[PDB]
Write a protein that binds this ligand. Structure first.
Ligand SMILES: O=c1[nH]c(=O)c2[nH]c(=O)[nH]c2[nH]1
Length: 499
């Protein structure tokens, strides 16, 4: 089933591939904005208990007499006039700090100091959504299309985001964040695969790196939009409309002809190849793509076949392990830069600006070393920066922050290498199912991150020890799965079993 011959008869690396890469990178930027805006639409302001002597009838002088030390969950039922020289719970409302953020979900639904474990839970739900999303968008994309799921996931992202921007109660907001996360999983996996299966190997790592840099630039776009737009409602709506645009233009993409011709469909694959030839101006071969030529090229995915198949069991388990390590470390480390600076937008900008050169260096490394050595190196670096950060004598001059940022760079490199490795490591029949299993593992790691952060009671170093031991062991396990370079993309189980 030789497809690179067809990608060369048709336009390879033509204007179609670059246009698709740009559009999908932009959509990924907006998707990262959706994912990372829980730091801005759910930011916790400086709150206190609504007291009769403050907000009814000096601030600093009249606040010390009406709120015990300022406590965010209790207030003096009756102020003690013998305090300038007997408490009560926060039953009068709340008063938030509306100077940095005009409004957020935390301030809107009073998720403070008694329901404080609802801001993380909501985030967890989002992660859970992506998990479930993969479980229903991985196999589905392997049965109905790489682009059909992408288009309907764009539409679902737009609709769910616009509905969450107008949620009247917290459960409705959580439900629509869950549905948005479902569509987010669909979009991420289908975008990665669709870029994987339309670019010739010459510039396949490059376009996958551009797609991954989509998230890196979305980390800065989040800060830009959240700086321009402060209210959580307007922020969510302004991030969700771009996905209405993405769904609108997503009908001009081409269904991945590798998947199309891999399955029993041939007229659809022929039409997509002819359209791609017409887009990038291939004159003679547009009509010389007759079904005779396609036959001369010589060309049910429900998570129940992938994880039990003799041909690929080490591949799936190790790839999902590396995905889990990436999710674990990345979502335990994204919020770990708070010690670098107090500013909140600068942290998002910093994450983007340290993932950009990390992914460029990973692209160079994998185009020089190879997928497996570079993945092992990136995971080992990301998992050993933490195990060395836990040994720093805490002078935080030029060692603590350096390791903290090298860990993030290694995590970004690991992600941009594991996307390529997982896409190239599985047959086109099970490519999206396996990438969906990887996304489920990554979201499971992200969910379990804060849960294992609770180990600080038994030891200040145990959470860091786990957060660094998982990537080290995953990278040392990423030296067992087979190398995938100068090998054509497998598009059936027999192709993998041939290797
Ligand atoms: O689900 C994700 N959210 C991100 O913010 C991100 N950033 C990155 O590099 N990969 C991912 N994946």
């Amino acid at each position: 089933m030789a497809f690179s011959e067809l990608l060369d008869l048709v336009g390879g690396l033509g204007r179609f591939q670059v246009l698709q890469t740009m559009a999908l990178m932009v959509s990924i930027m907006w998707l990262c904005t959706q994912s990372m805006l829980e730091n801005f639409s759910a930011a916790v302001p400086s709150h206190r208990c609504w007291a009769p002597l403050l907000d009814n009838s000096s601030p600093e002088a009249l606040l010390a007499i009406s709120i015990p030390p300022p406590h965010q969950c209790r207030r003096f039922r009756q102020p003690q006039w013998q305090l300038l020289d007997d408490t009560e719970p926060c039953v009068d409302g709340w008063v938030y700090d509306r100077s940095i953020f005009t409004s957020t979900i935390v301030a809107k639904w009073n998720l403070v100091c008694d329901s404080h474990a609802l801001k993380p839970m909501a985030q967890s739900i989002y992660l859970a959504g992506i998990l479930v999303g993969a479980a229903v968008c991985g196999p589905a994309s392997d049965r109905f299309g790489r682009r059909l799921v992408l288009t309907w996931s764009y539409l679902q992202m737009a609709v769910s985001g616009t509905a969450a921007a107008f949620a009247p109660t917290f459960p409705v907001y959580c439900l629509f964040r869950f549905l948005l996360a479902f569509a987010v999983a669909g979009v991420m996996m289908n975008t990665g695969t669709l870029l994987m299966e339309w670019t010739s190997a010459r510039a396949r790592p490059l376009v996958m790196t551009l797609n991954s840099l989509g998230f890196s630039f979305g980390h800065g776009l989040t800060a830009a939009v959240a700086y321009g737009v402060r209210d959580w409602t307007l922020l969510q709506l302004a991030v969700s409309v771009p996905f209405f645009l993405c769904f609108l233009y997503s009908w001009w993409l081409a269904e991945s002809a590798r998947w199309l011709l891999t399955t029993g469909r041939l007229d659809r694959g022929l039409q997509e190849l002819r359209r791609v030839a017409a887009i990038n101006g291939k004159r003679a071969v547009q009509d010389t793509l007759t079904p005779e030529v396609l036959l001369s090229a010589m060309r049910p995915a429900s998570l129940g076949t992938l994880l039990r198949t003799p041909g690929l069991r080490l591949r799936t388990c190790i790839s999902t392990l590396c995905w889990f390590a990436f999710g674990f470390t990345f979502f335990g480390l994204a919020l770990d830069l708070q010690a670098l600076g107090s500013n909140i937008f600068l942290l998002q900008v910093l994450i983007g600006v340290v993932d950009i050169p990390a992914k460029m260096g990973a692209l160079l490394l994998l185009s020089r070393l190879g997928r497996r050595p570079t993945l092992a190196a990136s995971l080992l670096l990301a998992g050993l920066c933490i195990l060395a950060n836990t040994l720093v004598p805490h002078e935080m001059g030029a060692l603590r922050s350096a390791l903290a940022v090298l860990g993030l760079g290694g995590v970004g490199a690991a992600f941009t290498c594991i996307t390529i490795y997982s896409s190239e490591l599985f047959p086109t029949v099970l490519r999206m199912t396996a990438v969906g299993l990887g996304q489920m593992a990554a979201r499971g790691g992200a969910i379990l991150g804060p849960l294992v952060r609770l180990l600080g009671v038994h030891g200040p170093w145990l959470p860091l020890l786990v957060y660094g031991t998982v990537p080290v062991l995953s990278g040392l396990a990423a030296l067992l799965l087979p190398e995938t370079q100068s090998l054509p993309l497998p598009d059936t189980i027999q192709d993998v079993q041939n290797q």
